[model samples]
Target chain A: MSAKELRCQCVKTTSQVRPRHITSLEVIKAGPHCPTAQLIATLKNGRKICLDLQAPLYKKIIKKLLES
Target chain B: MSAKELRCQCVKTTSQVRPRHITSLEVIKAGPHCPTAQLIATLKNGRKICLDLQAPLYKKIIKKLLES
Candidate 1:
């Protein structure tokens, strides 16, 4: 079978709580090659959260607090 | 206070409106070996979300409707 046709038949693809950290600023740390690796998000209460997009994408999203 | 001290110094921690398909029912289909195999999350708009504990954990969290 062709690669494109067989792709669909097999290939399948896919907050909160603890140490409320909402990035307030994001700087493009992706060097002079890719997009900015820095992105900040602020919380409702006023918390500055920073994200370095150097590592895996998910790491930045889930590397949050260890709260229970 | 040497190793532990360094650990402490280094160990510093850190939505969206979609058709959120919340869960409806979760059954413990772990072959009587673990927790419930299913976990449901209901969205505000009334969407049934399903999560299978067998797979990875984050896989369940970030899995949602894709809206542009």
Candidate 2:
């Protein structure tokens, strides 16, 4: 039943990416609505791609985004 | 008025910040729906904050997130 209500937008994901071309990123936490966490990305080319949160590099990107 | 419909969630903004503790970021473009673009950030401590997109240091962070 929960799978049907997952407000999550990611169905596909990218294993690699270049951050400069990324225009935006939206993170959706895994919960009753979704089975897994999501890293939805919007690129400069006007398309959206979901990224893998489980990847080491991708996780680093999030860390990098947060540093002072 | 459009202001009534500007679903934008930001009001206060930070002029300076250290990025390491950030957990998520959502970018909203400027449009008729909102007078200016918004950078909504989620910190590791479980709260939300808005960042100034026009600032020089913030731009630096954006680029730095791109890579080594």
Candidate 3:
């Protein structure tokens, strides 16, 4: 399936922010250091969310994006 | 080289926190959701730094750990 077909299933548990179903992914930058890496995703409702590139779940999504 | 021989080179550009040179890496959890995935690294001064597994630079360090 294409990224457009794939829905975002990301959630936020530790923070007060509500979880969102992201439908798009964007890598803002790749970190060679502490905070250089960042990834952004757009929720189904058009709100955007950001995560660390090293995030395990995010990697899973990236792998899926590559495989599909 | 072993992890012991590898030194942390992670830096921070956006946060209020000072950058640290991490010497060790630790994966806290994998996120199928937001905030679940986290990677921590110990600095030369015994400080621990955390990043997202999706963090581009952190993944670079992980690759180094596997290859060496």
Candidate 4:
């Protein structure tokens, strides 16, 4: 951990981020800096979006990625 | 999934990256586009480094992250 600021990077999340538009995805577990786990999606347009973990599509994507 | 360029992103990898120096981490599994799975690490300085997964430290990091 590179001394993360003691706060969550995203205050909101979206379920709109489709899988095809993702450039990279990161799963950040809850820690001292944040209370909830976060899924950070880097879109093809170079925008970083926080994904709603409860969304079915994102849930499947996370499951598939983790299965590897 | 994003349409990858059908080539491996990292031509080489390094074992020098320490966990504390990591800003972000991404694991890209081997796919139809790439022959080898890659572990991408973004450093505190904003430089992205490909990590040698066979290295003990990187193995541990991958294992830990996958646990979440």
Candidate 5:
């Protein structure tokens, strides 16, 4: 695939747990020369969580994005 | 739950991809005072990958460990 095609793809996730849960997980960007990119997420309770693009879960999400 | 019971629990995962794939993903330690611990894994092709317990996937695995 072209480098352009491998660019980071944004994604979101939702979850349900107690008074709060993960509301979304998103990817911002990735490139062939860099180790993917950082991910952003929000908790249903309104808290924010930052994830590394190299993270396994984010990595897994990125792979699916690239494939699709 | 008690702090001792929340200590890191190891877990493994297997996958199939190309000439080889991820063979395992494990958690080595975590604590009530700490943000989980680190995880270790071996690829089917013999490469090793270290993961932060805080990583979402590992975090999920750790939660299951604590619950079980």
Candidate 6:
């Protein structure tokens, strides 16, 4: 199959983020330095943005994961 | 030089998330509904995506950053 691509909303755990103020950022895995949260924001352009919560949260979700 | 393509994880700063549950999302900067964090996540496909922490986290990081 062709490479399937997807676009997701990235939301931080906070609620005071502004769009124009955002410049640029680098994406990293939920490592030690990163915090854990799923809370995100949907911008005026309908983009869902959030912080990195993979490490602390990934384990919780993996419990219900299905295997092929 | 060729276009630099870097893929990063997009975390949520939360402790509960699911890859499949993620339906469709957009990539907008920060906003009111969105909180302030440096969170992000990565998929099994080895793709690194993250929420736009350019506002809050950026401020914190920029304080110690150097420009060319």
DockQ values for all predictions?
A: 0.04, 0.19, 0.02, 0.24, 0.02, 0.04
lDDT of 6 at B31: 25
lDDT of 5 by residue, A5-49 (tens): 343333222212221234334333333542334245555566655
True-contact fraction in model 1 equals: 0.00
Error of 1 at B50 (Å): 12
Model 6 spans with C-alpha error above 4 angstroms: A1-12, A16-30, A46-68, B1-42, B48-68
Candidate 1: tens digits of C-alpha lDDT, residues B1-68: 11222212112210122223332222112112222222333444555343333444424333331110
Worst 10 residues of 5 chain B by lDDT: B11-20
> What fraction of the genuine interface contacts, i.e. the true contacts, does candidate 6 reproduce?
0.03
What is candidate 3's TM-score against the reference? 0.31
Task: Give the alpha carbon lDDT tens digit for every residue of A7-45 in model 6.
Answer: 223334433443333322233332223222223434345
Residues B1-68, model 2: lDDT tens digits:
55566665686576455776565566654545556666687767878777766566555544444421
Worst 10-residue lDDT window for candidate 4 chain B reads B59-68
A16-55, model 2: which lDDT tens digit per residue?
A: 5676555566654454556566567777787877776556
Candidate number with greatest TM-score: 4
- Docking level for model 6: incorrect
Candidate 2 stretches with Cα past 4 Å from truth are A1-24, A27-39, A42-48, A51-68, B1-4
lDDT of 4 by residue, A1-68 (tens): 43354788775676666666355666555556765555577766778777655447665654455455
Q: Which candidate is the best by lDDT?
A: 4
lDDT (10s digit) by residue, model 5, range B15-35: 122212343343333335333
Alpha carbon lDDT at A30, candidate 3: 29
Clashes of each: 24, 8, 12, 0, 1, 44
Among these predictions, the greatest DockQ belongs to 4
Q: lDDT rank, highest first?
A: 4, 2, 3, 5, 6, 1
TM-score of 5: 0.24
Please give the lDDT score at residue B4 for candidate 2.
62
TM-score of chain A of 4: 0.63
lDDT of 6 by residue, B9-68 (tens): 334533243333222222333223332333444445654444333344332222222110
